[PDB]
Amino acid sequence: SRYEKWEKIKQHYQHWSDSLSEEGRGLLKKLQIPIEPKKDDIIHSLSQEEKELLKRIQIDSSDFLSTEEKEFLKKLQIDIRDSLSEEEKELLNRIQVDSSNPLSEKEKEFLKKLKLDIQPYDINQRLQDTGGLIDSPSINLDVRKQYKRDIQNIDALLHQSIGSTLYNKIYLYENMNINNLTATLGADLVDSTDNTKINRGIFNEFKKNFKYSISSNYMIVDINERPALDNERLKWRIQLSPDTRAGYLENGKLILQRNIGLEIKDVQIIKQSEKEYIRIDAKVVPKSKIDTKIQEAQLNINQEWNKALGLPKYTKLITFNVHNRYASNIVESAYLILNEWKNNIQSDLIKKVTNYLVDGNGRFVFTDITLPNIAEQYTHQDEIYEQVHSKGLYVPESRSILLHGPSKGVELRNDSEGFIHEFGHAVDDYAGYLLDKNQSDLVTNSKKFIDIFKEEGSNLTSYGRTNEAEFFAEAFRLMHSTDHAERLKVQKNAPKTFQFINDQIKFIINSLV
């Protein structure tokens, strides 16, 4: 009985629930229902020029904002635009679809600082974005301190374990949007023509490396399984351990303590009401047990690649910064990503550049927390307005490549292409450094490449138009694609770029040691 199960769990927590202070309850509600920014107040604080700018800006052309930030800005844009006449509005929509032109400098610098003013107060999101590393300097300090306060108080509210009677007598459930874990597989996991069906091949991709999971925020789970909504194709079924701490929430839910591990027991395609879903069976285990598995994998992948790249065995090159629900896939796909990397790029280029990165204590960081909360970025990027979220990043100050697993890259088939793009930036860096080690600049800042960008910059991908550095990186990525057609387009549509990049590669490989 669904209702008896509910009643029995509610009874187990009944004293706890009765004992909550009003401030205790408020905190639990805030956790569940985040506090949104006030659009009207945001808009009122803009100058007339800024309002204009915001009316006509192409938000999805941004390459530094998170999904959440982008979604809020679009809503903000609707309000600002809803006094304009219909033609204006129709034109503004018609122009956005038929062209993805890059943002102007004016547009970009405006969005970068506006970023500071559009953050919701969202405790569970803050924990997921930071993987529990809540002191990370990616938001206002005073807001940071409130989060820490709230989170410490929630931890202290959640002191009562599910206990040895209930733990093996109940399942709990969580419906999940697949994009939350993999935006990349998400785009295809549903059958293209029959969306009552799951793509069997993508399903295998999703399942094959899904062995463990981490929850860094507070899971809100259903006592009784709820029929899936629109965006929900993942249906978790979870077994707690006797010492898992939790609290009861109204309408038959538990909130679980943060920092738990999950071992994946089974992943199956199931049918509910003539539609296909993915059942995930998981068991709660100590997070420490999963962190041990991650650290062992980090040790192994470094040993393997230090040997392959001829680095000292102790070299710390590859880092797993892993804290969220698709953990094991971040870890395992790193192996595949670096395989493709070595497959598609000349061995001497890879060795020369990687040694340069190692020489500056650089890293390959594979992570499922957002890039502003990665130290290899934020320790050199103090200004939140200069902090970037995206699929990947190269940070010259730390000689580090960062790769964010859960998100999906603009016009990138997979994570391997995203890594190779970022490696393009490292090549750009090393090439420029070999020109002048003292005042070390990027080779894409040389006047020659600037001249080449002005001619061929619009001849490859839409994202390549953004600027010299991105153009070089895109050109570099396409020149080393598994697809011969893509290598050929560069040679044919951007022959000076093609030649310039091959020359730099020779210059790099031929520099003496």
Q: Which residues are annotated as a binding site?
A: 421, 425, 463, 470
Q: Is 422 a catalytic residue?
A: yes
Enclosing H/E stretch for 177: strand 172-177
Q: Does 473 bind Zn ion (CB under 5 A)?
A: yes
* Rounded Cα gap, residues 346 and 491, in angstroms: 18
Q: Give the span between the Cα atoms of 53 and 38, in whole angstroms.
A: 19
For Zn ion, give the closer residue by CB, 181 or 442: 442
- Least Å from the CB of residue 473 to Zn ion: 5
Sheet holding 232-239, edge to edge: 212-215, 260-271, 276-285, 232-239, 172-177, 220-222, 253-256, 246-249
429 vs 470 by CB, closer to Zn ion: 470
Exposed/middle/buried for residue 443 (C-beta within 10 Å: 0-12, 13-18, 19+):
buried
Site for Zn ion in 98-127 (CB under 5 A): none
Q: Which is nearer to Zn ion, 136 or 461 (CB)?
A: 461
- Total residues interacting with Zn ion, rule: CB under 5 A: 2
What residues form the annotated binding site for Zn(2+)? 421, 425, 463, 470
Q: Is 218 or 423 the residue whose CB approaches Zn ion more closely? A: 423
- DSSP letter at 253 equals E
Nearer to Zn ion, 210 or 476 (CB): 476
Residue 313 neighbours by CB under 8 Å, 6+ apart: 303, 306, 307
Which of these ranges, 30-38, 78-86, 194-202, 470-478, lies near Zn ion under the rule CB under 5 A? 470-478
3-state SS, residue 318:
strand
Q: Are 385 and 350 in contact (CB under 8 A)?
A: no
Output 61 or 175, the one with its CB closest to Zn ion: 61
Minimum separation from the CB atom of position 394 to Zn ion (A): 7
The least distance separating Zn ion from the CB of residue 117, rounded to whole angstroms, comes to 26
388 counts as binding Zn ion under rule CB under 5 A? no
CA gyration radius for the chain?
A: 25
The stretch near Zn ion (CB under 5 A) out of 238-246, 253-261, 364-372, 469-477 is 469-477
Task: Tell me the window of 233-241, 305-313, 426-434, 464-472 that interacts with Zn ion (CB under 5 A).
Answer: 464-472
Report the nearest approach of Zn ion to the CB of residue 493 (Å): 19
- Token look-up 């006047």 returns 447
Q: Ramachandran region of residue 160, left (φ > 0), alpha (ψ -120 to 50) or beta?
A: beta
For the bound state, the minimum distance from the C-beta of residue 110 to Zn ion, rounded and expressed in Å, comes to: 21
318 binds Zn ion (CB under 5 A): no
Residue type, 110: F
Q: Where are the beta strands (DSSP E) in 240-331?
A: 246-249, 253-256, 260-271, 276-285, 318-321
Q: Select which of 174, 422, 456, 468 is catalytic.
A: 422
Nearest-approach distance from CB 347 to Zn ion, in angstroms: 24
Q: Is 502 left (phi over 0), alpha (psi -120 to 50) or beta?
A: alpha
3-state DSSP of 374-442: CHHHHCCCCCHHHCCCCCEEEEHHHCEEEEECCCCCCCCCCHHHHHHHHHHHHHHHHHHHHHCCCCCCC
Question: What is the DSSP pairing of strand 220-222 with strand 400-404?
Answer: unpaired
Q: Which residues are catalytic?
A: 422
Which stretches of the chain bind Zn ion, using CB under 5 A? 470, 473
